[PDB]
Ligand binder design. Structure first.
Ligand SMILES: [Mg+2]
Ligand SMILES: [Zn+2]
Ligand SMILES: [Zn+2]
Ligand SMILES: [Zn+2]
Lengths: 259, 231, 47, 59, 107, 614, 167, 100
């Protein structure tokens, strides 16, 4: 009973099907086919063409966007099938209408092709941009990926261009090629576009409980840069009150005294 | 919650059966008016035959099953006419108990059946006595209470609304709303005026019955004493 | 005696099936009498 | 934005996700893009064409 | 129409997992993220979620409140049309320590 | 209600249960500890009843969902009670189980075989099988334990077989069959069980007597000392214990007694507390009758009542503040108790301090739930029980009956020139009562005019609802803006998320509309019929035909009638085909007519149809 | 119909004063009230219109007591009463009388001296009204179906007596 | 994924168990006063939400009068699910039901 209650939670967050590295490519296959069941609304304008309804209404805004339930980005749908509300041979099916409104609701079966990239998965991306604190990438030239300065190896050194933009140099001492291979550190869904947080560096690091003891110096770089980003953003669109002194003087806030 | 179900029975909100059929015949009161007005229906045969259009119904109903059974029940009913209710035959039960009134032409209440047959016998009158019987059978079919009808509310409203007209006092037994309250509202085991109606025979005379009344009536010592003298 | 009947309901661990006119009104469900004694379904042509 | 007529009531995986080969993905993409090309869906097909292009060529 | 539609008809959020209208709340999102209806009862405090191998939260399961506390789960919320008095009744019953569980279909 | 806003999910059933303390602590938005509601300056104090974590209050944003007073639904909080309290509503029940249990073996004083007999009968009744529950009494073999355990086995065998046999057929489901007669048989048994439970004096399991518990009007229990006959009985039955190895009683002692008893007698209580089978497999715990916490309802339902200028304090906040003062005081008493102790002996004072602490918080808890269970204060503040039963009650005054929108009231005036199925609507009502008419190709012409006409010219329109969900009021606008919006009614939706939707026009009540006419008292459904709207110019009263006089039982002696304007087509169809006047010619009472002409018309007919009339 | 209102300033130091405060003055109030803050006797008032004006030092703002009723009125009488003081005299109490004109409306009850009351069903035009041989059209029309149930024969004899006495 | 497939199987099994086949149905061949009222109301609601109309609305502006016209020609594409007190049902089309 002590571990029985916690066991249900582990199975809720358990990765159903893991992505395997194959064909000596080194990259893990993340595109998967999953058959699903939807409960969708049907508009009265689509009462003569219901399959077009379910498609234009709910399935089309679903593609090229991450869906939390399937645990990936819906690349498309295949084989839509409306479940008849009447258990029974004909193409004429029936859907239950809400007592209050003219809209009907039905169960649907459709197969989804989703891009399901879990953490630990090795992926390849084409370098979009490369700043002093991050490297921009594109998985299959459609999905956004980013490798932060701390996730980049220590041996690597960035070089900023004065002419016009910058470039990162690897351990060997040569600039990085168009395509780059990385491991999935985290996947950010909540935002507008799906962003993959990547790592270029990778349990038994304990030297008499040394792994448990955190190196404050290294832990600071990842926290300070995180806070600096969060605070600068919170200062954007910040409306502060205009204060006028009992003389007719407006109090102007400017850290820099001279021009 | 009490309403008419799609199986014609009177069911409560939770599906529990209250009645197997509304009033035992499934007739809507707002329809049961000219259903016995046979002369009226006869004078307006073709008008009502056009009203209760049977051409769009003949393929959806049965015209013999119930009609045959109605004769079998009438047969055993006539056999035990003089016989008492406890000795009556229980072989064949009513036609409404065996055949759905909205699907079988002839599954009519025995009260309607007796009344209709009596009209055709006592009145010999281009309408045949057989084609008129079908029209009245069809009228009963079209006079059925609709499944879904809130017969529960309608009943309480049909007892409530006219009980406002009896708010005035007496012009012995409890009457009006107090008596209605004794029944419906309190189901009293201790009634204000408990009574018994005793049916007297024919061999017992008016004098004998009055002597019998005296024999049961409570007699007190007070009722026989004229004077008490205490010295 | 709202709180009294509620107490008896909780102690029974009762499930209100929402089949009485009163219960349906409480939860904003359509009454099962008359027009609520059935369901309306739309016939759709495409498979 | 996020309504019953826009988004579904519930989505449920009827079975475990079955992995598909590079050729199956490309065969699906070609089938889907052709069927949809035949309003905001157009921008999604534009992105889908880039994936199809990456699974056989270079951007 | 009289006793609901043109009186106190409210489209209210309900959690399908625990069946309640009072535990549901709109999550506070980040600068780019969108707000999602989340249940306070079924969601677990982020720190308390501790661990065959290690498991990782799919990001879509972590939501934040106005106080800045991170939560895991409690996303099985839907919308139901109810009278507003029901919300006031459930609230009053809750004070007395009585819980109403609304079984909501589809699941 | 909006037809453009359908709902996909529905409540199918409501389950009644008790909130656990652990459950409340997790869902809580903030712990309430402060009896004050406002800081100085005017901001709500942190940890008080007006805390912003409980929802948006005083033009501040909610500190939980971040929304303002309109969109914030409010959030539940909690008060941590320093000592457990008896829940007023379930005190009578916990009292029954306290008097029915043995204080030594911690089982009910009734014999185990008799208790099992009730558990068996109550398990069979979870499923719709009454006949089987009575047939169990037929199963029969100072009696040895080896024999009695065989009786319990044979009875359990019949119960398991009778359930499975009925489960095989369509006699009972896995969720169990439940009818009123089944409920009657359950109610009879649960009563008989408690009656047998309370009757036993000497425990049938272990022959030792327990001290009798007495009670007062308020939630407080006492323990009456045993008599010398029962004390000597405890001594002689004291040796058999070794081989196996009036005074007030605190809430903790009662909870601890019931804790063990509810564990040891879990089998019977499983069916005593479950009407249908317990599929959730939850344990029946004694702490359900006790309150270790109090839920703080959202600020939304505890807002201070404003009457004109004066802003009056909410009565619930007042009762809740009282619970908070006592809680802080007991926290100090327990802190002083923790300090000191070597010096004791006179422990009659430490228990006296404890008894006061317990009876004070209990009273404050009682006062908040049910006032008619709290001590007299020199009219008291109403509790939550009182709030649900103020007069007729919340259920009768605000659920079964409600004040409605889109409705009007006026004195009725007679009219023989309108149809018997019509109602003469004054132009005053016609310019205020509107219908949400969705704009389409077939009615674009009709609604464009209404939009141009506006909210003061009949037939007009007061508002226009766009497909995005927003509303555009036509009230302040001039003929120029109205003309522009009318030419924008049938424009195609650019947004794909609302392409399904079409604009709505909140158009004036026209002569084709249905209305519900009502004349109180509504003694029969004929007193609430559907009439066809006929807007009559220069009118200040509702005009009604003489044929309607009978059904409404309305005489034009200065009578008043209610007009209801249903706002959807399903409600329209009903008022035009089911509750409409014409379908109410005959009353269902006797099937006789309640419609006809009343006075002048009868006298006119006798003259018009006379032979002399040419 | 005449209705009287008492505008008292009591709710010992005087704070509210009848009239208008300097520097602060919301638009078009002078149309209803005179320099003294009291209304012009004869002025038409609707609900929302200012019925009096004052200034309270506690709020340092010029406030007004609004007139609120569904029926509009005219000011018939304004009386200033400065009693309950010996030497320290200042006005705080004012009595304002409203004249509400009431023409017979559809619904108003009318009755003869025989208990025959009836509501005004309509104000029938004289051209549409039945006209007598004399050329007179009745002021009031009573329905004949009123008399058989009420049995108010006193009204019947009152009708031929009133006619005889008029002639 | 595995627990849902079972739940869907049970849901559809119970549905089929409750459905009364077209031949075994034994309710009134007549459309009840209540059925007519809801059909006309619901179809009117559909008509107002730009639903494809199967009749020629010769200057008709009222959706209910359109729904009435569609009923007269039996062109209303709706079905009545008649429930019995056990939860079982009979699906009847608007077309096949007799209207007075
Ligand atoms: Mg009268
Ligand atoms: Zn929940
Ligand atoms: Zn909030
Ligand atoms: Zn014992």
């Amino acid at each position: 009973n002590e571990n029985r209650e916690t066991a249900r939670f582990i199975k809720k967050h358990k990765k159903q099907v893991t992505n395997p590295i194959d064909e000596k490519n080194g990259t893990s296959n993340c595109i998967v086919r999953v058959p699903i069941a939807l409960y969708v609304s049907l508009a009265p304008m689509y009462l003569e063409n219901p399959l077009q309804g379910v498609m234009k209404q709910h399935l089309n805004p679903l593609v090229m966007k991450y869906n939390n339930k399937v645990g990936g980005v819906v690349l498309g749908y295949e084989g839509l099938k409306i479940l008849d509300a009447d258990p029974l041979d004909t193409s004429e099916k029936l859907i239950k209408i809400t007592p209050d409104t003219p809209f009907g609701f039905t169960w649907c079966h459709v197969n989804l092709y989703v891009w399901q990239p879990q953490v630990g998965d090795v992926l390849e991306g084409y370098i979009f941009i490369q700043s002093a604190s991050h490297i921009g990438l594109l998985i299959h030239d459609a999905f956004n990926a980013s490798i932060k300065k701390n996730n980049i190896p220590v041996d690597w050194t960035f070089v900023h261009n004065d002419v016009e933009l910058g470039h990162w140099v690897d351990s060997n001492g040569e600039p990085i090629d168009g395509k780059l291979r990385f491991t999935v550190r985290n996947v950010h869904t909540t935002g507008r576009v799906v962003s993959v947080d990547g790592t270029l560096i990778s349990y038994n690091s304990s030297r008499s409980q040394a792994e448990s003891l955190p190196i404050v110096s290294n832990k600071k770089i990842v926290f300070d840069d995180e806070v600096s980003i969060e605070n600068k953003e919170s200062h954007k669109e910040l409306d502060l009150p205009e204060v006028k002194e009992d003389n007719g003087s407006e109090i102007v806030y400017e850290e820099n005294t001279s021009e | 919650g009490v309403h008419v179900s799609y199986d014609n029975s009177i069911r409560d909100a939770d599906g529990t059966l209250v009645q197997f059929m509304y009033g035992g015949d499934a007739i809507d009161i707002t329809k049961e008016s000219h259903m016995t007005q046979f002369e009226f229906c006869l004078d307006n045969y073709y008008a009502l035959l056009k009203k209760y259009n049977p051409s769009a119904l003949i393929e959806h109903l049965d015209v013999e099953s119930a009609l045959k059974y109605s004769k079998k029940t009438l047969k055993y009913r006539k056999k035990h006419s003089k016989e008492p209710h406890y000795k009556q035959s229980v072989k064949y039960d009513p036609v409404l108990a065996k055949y759905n009134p909205a699907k079988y032409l002839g599954s009519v209440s025995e009260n309607f059946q007796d009344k209709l047959e009596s009209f055709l016998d006592k009145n010999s009158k281009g309408v045949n006595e057989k084609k008129f019987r079908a029209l009245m059978q069809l009228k009963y079919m079209r006079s059925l209470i609709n499944p879904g009808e809130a017969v529960g509310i309608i009943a309480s409203q049909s007892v409530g609304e006219p009980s406002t007209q009896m708010t005035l006092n007496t012009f012995n037994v409890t009457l009006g709303i107090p008596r209605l309250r004794e029944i419906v509202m309190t189901a009293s085991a201790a009634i204000k005026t408990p009574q018994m109606t005793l049916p007297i025979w024919n061999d017992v005379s008016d004098e004998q019955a009055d002597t019998f009344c005296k024999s049961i009536s409570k007699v007190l010592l007070s009722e026989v004493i004229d004077k008490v003298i205490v010295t | 005696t709202t709180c009294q009947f509620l107490t008896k309901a909780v102690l029974d661990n009762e499930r209100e099936q929402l089949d009485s006119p009163s219960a349906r009104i409480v939860v904003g469900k359509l009454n099962n009498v008359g027009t609520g004694s059935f369901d309306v379904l739309a016939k759709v042509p495409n498979a | 934005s996020a309504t019953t007529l826009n988004t579904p009531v519930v989505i449920h995986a009827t079975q475990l996700p079955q992995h598909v080969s590079t050729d199956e993905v490309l065969q699906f993409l070609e089938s889907f893009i052709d069927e949809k090309e035949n309003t905001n869906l157009s921008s999604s097909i534009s992105q889908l064409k880039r994936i199809q292009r990456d699974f056989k060529g270079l951007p | 129409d009289r006793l609901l539609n043109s009186s106190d008809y409210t489209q209210a959020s309900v959690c399908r997992e625990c069946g309640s209208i009072l535990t549901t709340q709109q999550s506070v999102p980040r600068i780019g993220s969108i707000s999602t209806v989340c249940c306070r009862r079924c969601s677990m405090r982020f720190e308390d979620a501790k661990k065959g191998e290690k498991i990782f939260i799919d990001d879509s399961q972590i939501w934040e409140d106005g106080q800045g506390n991170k939560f895991v789960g409690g996303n099985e919320t839907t919308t139901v049309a109810i009278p507003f008095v029901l919300k006031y009744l459930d609230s009053e019953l809750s004070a007395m320590g009585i819980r109403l569980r609304y079984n909501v279909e589809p699941k | 209600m909006d037809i453009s806003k359908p709902v996909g999910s529905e409540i199918t059933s409501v389950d009644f249960g008790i909130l656990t303390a652990k459950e409340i602590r997790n869902l809580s938005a903030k712990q309430i500890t402060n009896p004050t509601v406002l800081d100085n300056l005017g901001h709500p104090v942190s940890g008080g009843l007006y805390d912003l974590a409980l929802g948006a209050f005083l033009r501040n944003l909610c500190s939980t969902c971040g929304l303002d007073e309109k969109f914030c639904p409010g959030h539940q909080g909690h008060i941590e009670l320093p000592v457990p309290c008896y829940n007023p509503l379930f005190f009578n029940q916990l009292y029954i189980y306290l008097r029915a249990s043995c204080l030594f073996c911690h089982h009910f004083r009734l014999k185990s075989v008799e208790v099992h007999r009730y558990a068996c009968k109550l398990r069979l009744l979870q499923y719709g099988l009454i006949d089987e529950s009575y047939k169990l009494d037929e199963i029969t073999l100072d009696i040895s334990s080896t024999l009695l355990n065989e009786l319990k086995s044979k009875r359990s065998e019949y119960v398991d077989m009778a359930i499975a046999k009925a489960l095989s057929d369509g006699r009972t489901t896995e969720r169990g069959s439940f009818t009123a007669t089944v409920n009657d048989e359950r109610k009879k048994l649960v009563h008989e069980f408690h009656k047998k439970l309370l009757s036993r004096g000497k425990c049938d399991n272990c022959g030792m007597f327990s001290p009798k518990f007495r009670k007062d009007g308020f939630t407080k229990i006492f323990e009456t000392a045993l008599n010398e006959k029962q004390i000597t009985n405890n001594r002689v039955k004291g040796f058999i214990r070794q081989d196996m190895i009036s005074t007030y009683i605190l809430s903790t002692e009662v909870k601890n007694i019931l804790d063990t008893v509810f564990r040891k007698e879990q089998c019977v209580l499983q069916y005593v507390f479950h009407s249908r089978p317990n599929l959730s497999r939850k344990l029946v715990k004694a702490d359900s009758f006790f309150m270790d916490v109090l839920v703080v309802p959202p600020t939304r339902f505890r807002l201070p009542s404003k009457l004109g200028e004066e802003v009056h304090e909410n009565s619930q906040n007042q009762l809740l503040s009282k619970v908070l003062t006592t809680s802080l005081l007991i926290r100090d008493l327990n802190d002083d108790l923790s300090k000191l102790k070597v010096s004791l002996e006179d422990r009659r004072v430490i228990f006296s301090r404890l008894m006061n602490a317990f009876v004070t918080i209990q009273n404050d808890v009682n006062a908040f739930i049910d006032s008619t269970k709290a001590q007299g204060r020199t009219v008291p503040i109403p509790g939550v029980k009182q709030a649900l039963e103020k007069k007729e009650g919340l259920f009768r005054k605000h659920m079964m009956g409600k004040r409605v929108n889109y409705a009007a009231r006026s004195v009725i005036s007679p009219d023989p020139n309108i149809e018997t199925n019509e109602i003469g609507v004054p132009p005053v009502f016609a310019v205020k009562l509107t219908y949400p008419e969705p704009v389409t190709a077939y009615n674009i012409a009709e609604l464009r005019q209404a939009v141009i006409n506006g909210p003061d010219k009949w037939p007009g329109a007061t508002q226009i609802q766009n497909e995005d969900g927003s509303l555009v009021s036509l009230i302040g606008m001039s003929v120029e803006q109205r003309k522009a919006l009318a030419n924008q009614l049938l424009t195609p939706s650019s947004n794909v998320s609302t392409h399904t939707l079409n604009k709505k026009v909140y158009r004036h009540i026209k002569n084709r509309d249905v209305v519900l006419m009502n004349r109180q008292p509504t003694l029969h459904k004929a007193s609430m019929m559907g009439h066809k709207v006929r807007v009559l110019p220069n009118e200040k009263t509702l005009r009604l035909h003489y044929a309607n006089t009978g059904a409404y039982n309305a005489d034009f002696d200065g009578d008043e009638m209610n007009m209801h304007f249903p706002q959807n087509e399903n409600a329209r169809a009903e008022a035009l085909n089911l509750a409409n006047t014409d379908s109410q010619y005959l009353t269902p009472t006797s099937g006789s007519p309640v419609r006809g002409l009343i006075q002048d018309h009868i006298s006119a007919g006798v003259w018009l149809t006379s032979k002399d009339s040419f | 119909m005449y209705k009287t209102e008492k505008v008292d300033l009591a709710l010992d130091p005087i704070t509210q004063h009848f009239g208008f405060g300097n520097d602060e003055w919301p638009k078009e109030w002078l149309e209803k009230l005179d320099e003294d803050g009291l209304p012009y006797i004869g002025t038409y008032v609707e609900e929302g219109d200012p019925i009096c004006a004052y200034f309270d030092d506690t709020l340092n703002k010029t406030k007004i007591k609004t007139y609120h009723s569904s029926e509009p009125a005219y000011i018939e009488e304004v009386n200033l009463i400065g009693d309950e003081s010996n030497k320290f005299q200042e006005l705080q109490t004012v009595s304002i009388k409203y004249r509400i004109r009431r023409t017979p409306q559809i619904g108003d009850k009318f009755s003869s001296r025989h208990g025959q009351k009836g509501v005004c069903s309509r104000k029938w035009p004289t051209i549409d009204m039945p006209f007598s041989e004399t050329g007179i059209q009745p002021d009031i029309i009573i329905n004949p179906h009123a008399f058989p149930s009420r049995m108010t024969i006193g009204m019947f004899v009152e009708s031929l007596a009133g006619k005889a006495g008029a002639l | 994924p595995e627990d849902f497939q079972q739940h869907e199987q049970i849901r559809r099994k119970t549905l089929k168990e409750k459905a009364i086949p077209k031949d075994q149905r034994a309710t009134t061949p007549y459309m009840t006063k209540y059925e007519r009222a809801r059909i006309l109301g619901t179809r009117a609601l559909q008509i107002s939400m730009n639903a494809p109309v199967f009749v020629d609305l010769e200057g008709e502006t009222d959706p209910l009068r359109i729904a009435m016209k569609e009923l007269a020609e039996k062109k209303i594409p709706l079905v009545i699910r008649r429930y019995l007190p056990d939860g079982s049902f009979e699906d009847w089309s608007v077309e096949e039901l007799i209207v007075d």
